[PDB]
Amino acid sequence: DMNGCYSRLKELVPTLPQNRKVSKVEILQHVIDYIRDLQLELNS
């Protein structure tokens, strides 16, 4: 469900804390930035 996915994203993304609140938009912003960071880590 939605809140399980958001919690998992906080666990997986190392720029987000886990147990203090973060806006869901700022969560997804960090997710986008982290996905780009990992894609670049592999390929130019």
Next chain:
Amino acid sequence: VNVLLYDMNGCYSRLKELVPTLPQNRKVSKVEILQHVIDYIRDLQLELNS
């Protein structure tokens, strides 16, 4: 070279474009988008190091 900030609508749009398993045209729910995002992050993480 993107450092753009997105709102909620923009975030879900950008995630559909970033995540290769998400169709940019299909009628996917927000929870479905996040489920694909989670599995994709995990795959990327597993490809980083050994």
